[PDB]
Design an enzyme around this catalytic site. Structure first.
Site, short mmCIF file in Angstrom:
data_model
loop_
_atom_site.label_atom_id
_atom_site.label_comp_id
_atom_site.label_asym_id
_atom_site.label_seq_id
_atom_site.Cartn_x
_atom_site.Cartn_y
_atom_site.Cartn_z
N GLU A 35 0.88 -1.22 0.00
CA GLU A 35 0.00 0.00 0.00
C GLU A 35 0.89 1.24 0.00
O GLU A 35 0.57 2.20 -0.71
CB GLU A 35 -0.91 0.03 1.20
CG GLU A 35 -2.02 -0.98 1.11
CD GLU A 35 -3.06 -0.70 0.06
OE1 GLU A 35 -2.98 0.41 -0.60
OE2 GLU A 35 -3.92 -1.58 -0.21
N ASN A 46 -7.64 9.36 -5.76
CA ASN A 46 -8.50 8.47 -6.57
C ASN A 46 -9.37 9.20 -7.52
O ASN A 46 -9.60 10.34 -7.37
CB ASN A 46 -9.34 7.61 -5.70
CG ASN A 46 -8.50 6.73 -4.88
OD1 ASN A 46 -8.49 6.81 -3.67
ND2 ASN A 46 -7.67 5.98 -5.55
N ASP A 48 -12.53 9.06 -7.99
CA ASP A 48 -13.76 9.58 -7.42
C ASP A 48 -13.57 10.83 -6.54
O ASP A 48 -14.54 11.26 -5.87
CB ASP A 48 -14.44 8.46 -6.67
CG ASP A 48 -13.85 8.22 -5.31
OD1 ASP A 48 -12.67 8.58 -5.07
OD2 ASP A 48 -14.57 7.74 -4.43
N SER A 50 -11.69 11.11 -3.79
CA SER A 50 -11.20 10.74 -2.49
C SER A 50 -9.68 10.60 -2.57
O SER A 50 -9.10 10.55 -3.61
CB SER A 50 -11.88 9.46 -2.02
OG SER A 50 -11.45 8.37 -2.78
N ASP A 52 -6.36 8.45 -0.46
CA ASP A 52 -5.84 7.44 0.46
C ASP A 52 -4.65 7.93 1.23
O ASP A 52 -3.76 8.58 0.63
CB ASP A 52 -5.39 6.20 -0.36
CG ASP A 52 -6.43 5.68 -1.34
OD1 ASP A 52 -7.59 5.68 -1.02
OD2 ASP A 52 -6.08 5.18 -2.41
N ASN A 59 -8.94 5.47 3.18
CA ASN A 59 -9.65 6.31 2.22
C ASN A 59 -10.58 7.30 2.85
O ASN A 59 -11.28 7.01 3.80
CB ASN A 59 -10.36 5.41 1.20
CG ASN A 59 -10.96 6.15 0.08
OD1 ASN A 59 -10.28 6.46 -0.89
ND2 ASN A 59 -12.22 6.49 0.19
N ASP A 101 -15.49 -4.52 9.33
CA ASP A 101 -16.68 -3.94 8.65
C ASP A 101 -17.43 -4.98 7.80
O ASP A 101 -18.52 -4.65 7.28
CB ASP A 101 -16.28 -2.79 7.72
CG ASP A 101 -17.44 -1.78 7.41
OD1 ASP A 101 -18.13 -1.37 8.36
OD2 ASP A 101 -17.58 -1.42 6.22
#
Ligand code: NA
Length: 129
Positions: A35, A46, A48, A50, A52, A59, A101
């Protein structure tokens, strides 16, 4: 800060990741290598809108607040910037929530593509843990 492999392995253990939700320590070290290259300061934007953040590429659409991700949540109750610190506490705490989650470590694309099903124990070999 850029961690050494065993240094990170050792810190993750102190913060309770080893076998957290049944994910052994090597999983978490492998996820951090691919990562962030073990760099707390890594960021990546990203499509969209967003971003990270940090050693575990958390995110801003769901987990932290960066002020620039419209309509997004902040489920970890923290500024995104606080996941860039040399102290990995906030990253680890937030990652515990993410892995809980429902999707486990599949929340981390590079874990799925590069760590899942591999000999993840290699990532802690040689370390004094
Ligand atoms: Na957010």
């Amino acid at each position: 800060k850029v961690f050494g492999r065993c240094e990170l392995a050792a810190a993750m253990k102190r913060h309770g990741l080893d076998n957290y939700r049944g994910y052994s320590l090597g999983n978490w070290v492998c996820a951090a290598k691919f990562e962030s290259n073990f760099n707390t300061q890594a960021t990546n934007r990203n499509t969209d809108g967003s971003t990270d953040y940090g050693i575990l590429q958390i995110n801003s659409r769901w987990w932290c607040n960066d002020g620039r991700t419209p309509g997004s949540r902040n489920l970890c109750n923290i500024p995104c910037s606080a996941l860039l610190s040399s102290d990995i506490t906030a990253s680890v705490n937030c990652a515990k929530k993410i892995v809980s989650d429902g999707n486990g470590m599949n929340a981390w694309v590079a874990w799925r593509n590069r760590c899942k099903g591999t000999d993840v124990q290699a990532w802690i070999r040689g370390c004094r843990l």
